[PDB]
Design a protein around this ligand. Structure first.
Ligand SMILES: [Zn+2]
Lengths: 268, 166, 45
């Protein structure tokens, strides 16, 4: 949504139904900034999932402020279901969560009334006080699965080797350079699509072509050779043999290299 | 094309047309003019014996390249060269283009050596029409005895009954 | 005319000047000239 800022015309009343001011009443919601491992962030950030379903329970034990995640069994069995939430920052300051939303575009002292502001509907969703990281519990039966997965992260290769052609070497050179095989592809066949067009123009007679030229000069005073020729479908020799008699070309003006009507006929 | 013919290494018109988008009629006119003025320069300057270097057919020089393109063994290539050499004696195909003569000799020896390549694959590789290759094989089936190398069927590497009939 | 031997087939071949230098049995384009028929004297010191 491209828009112009520094509007002293109060155009935002007419072009934006929603208010441009930041909504601030949700800023008191407590937000925990949680960092996730690869598997859990993969299964918790994809948009095809996350239909509002329950993903687990949080147990906060006041004896030592131990915060644990108790995931449900519906997702997987290889991943653990008990995670130790470590608080890397008990108190987090000056960290807020704000939203971005598209608007309703339908219905010294020196200043410049143009600053190129892109307005968006914004609101503080909440305030961040607890920075968290998720580590799986050591005693979980599926923790060794996570250790094996992290070892397999650096073990497997995502790149395959170069493919070596196993057939006879002359068969590979059947298509290369010296080849009977003409290109059946239609890629960049400019000559094929340009030589198929043929503009052929008969010698229809002098009085009719000059009447047609006068009608076209009544339509527009200045004409190019190509434009007039494609408008009348006449050969360039005959068209020139009429145009020099009935008109003239411009050599120096702003409309140069254009055939325009003679000034004897311009008044008519 | 003149340079290829001069070094006994001649390619065909379709090869150079595969490189250069050249119109065939004026290509032939240009080649004829260049041959005329080259013979004139040879007569005016140093004289060169042609000894079959400007030959129109040159069908013996197309067999190894086409056999390489089809990935054929060597003995199929030499048998095809012998066949195409003896195809000149046959008057029924003496007027055919050397490309088609080489292709039908190669296909005859492919069928002779039980090389598992169809006529459609040869036609796709070398752009001789499969009808043309089939007709050439049919018209060379009557002259099986002369075309096939005698010492090959003497040594038993190939036999004349391997060729399918028409 | 002159005797030649292919590089790996080791079959004796006779080549004239107009013949291309290839093996009739191998097609290997490296040929070795045959050893001379004349006797060669080596002083055994
Ligand atoms: Zn050899």
């Amino acid at each position: 949504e491209v828009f112009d800022g520094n509007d002293i015309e109060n155009n935002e009343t007419k072009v934006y139904e929603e208010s441009l001011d930041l909504d601030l009443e949700r800023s008191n919601r407590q937000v925990w900034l949680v960092r996730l491992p690869m598997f859990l962030a993969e299964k918790w950030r994809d948009r095809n999932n996350l239909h509002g379903q329950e993903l687990g329970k949080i147990r906060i034990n006041k004896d030592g402020s131990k915060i644990t995640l108790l995931l449900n069994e519906n997702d997987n069995d290889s991943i653990p279901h008990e995670y130790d939430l470590e608080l890397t920052k008990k108190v987090v300051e000056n960290e807020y969560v704000f939203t971005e939303q598209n608007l309703k575009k339908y219905q010294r002292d020196r200043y410049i009334p143009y600053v190129k502001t892109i307005p968006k509907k914004t609101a503080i969703v909440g305030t961040v006080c607890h920075e968290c990281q998720v580590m799986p519990s050591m005693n979980d039966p599926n923790y060794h699965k996570i250790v094996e997965q992290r070892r397999n992260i650096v073990k497997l290769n995502n790149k395959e080797r170069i493919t070596t052609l196993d057939e006879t070497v002359g068969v590979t050179m059947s298509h290369t350079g010296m080849s009977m095989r003409s290109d059946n592809s239609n890629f960049l066949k400019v000559g094929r699509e340009k030589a198929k067009s043929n503009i052929k123009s008969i010698r229809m007679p002098k009085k009719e072509i000059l009447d047609y030229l006068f009608k076209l000069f009544d339509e527009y005073d200045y004409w190019s050779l190509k434009g007039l020729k494609e408008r009348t479908r006449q050969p360039e020799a005959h068209l020139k043999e009429c145009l020099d008699k009935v008109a003239t070309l411009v050599k120096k003006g702003p409309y140069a290299f254009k055939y325009t009507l003679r000034p004897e006929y311009k008044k008519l | 094309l003149i340079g290829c013919r001069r070094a006994e290494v001649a390619r065909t018109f379709k090869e150079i047309q595969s490189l250069i988008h050249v119109k065939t009629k004026e290509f032939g006119k240009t080649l004829n003019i260049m041959k005329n003025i080259l013979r004139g320069k040879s007569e005016d300057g140093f004289l060169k014996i042609d000894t079959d270097n400007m030959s129109g057919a040159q069908n013996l020089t197309y067999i190894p390249r086409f056999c390489s393109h089809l990935g054929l063994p060597m003995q199929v290539t030499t048998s095809a060269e012998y066949t195409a050499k003896k195809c000149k004696e046959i008057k029924e195909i003496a007027g055919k283009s050397p490309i088609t003569i080489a292709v039908v000799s190669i296909y005859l020896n492919i069928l002779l050596f039980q090389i598992p390549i169809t006529a459609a694959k040869v036609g796709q590789t070398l752009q001789v029409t499969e009808g043309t290759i089939k007709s050439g094989y049919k018209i060379l089936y009557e002259h099986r005895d002369k075309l096939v190398d005698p010492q090959l069927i003497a040594n038993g590497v190939v036999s004349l009954d391997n060729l399918p009939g028409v | 005319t002159l005797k030649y031997i292919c590089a790996e087939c080791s079959s004796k071949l006779s080549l004239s000047r107009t013949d291309a230098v290839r093996c009739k049995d191998c097609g290997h384009r490296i040929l070795l000239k045959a050893r001379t028929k004349r006797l060669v004297q080596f002083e055994a010191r």
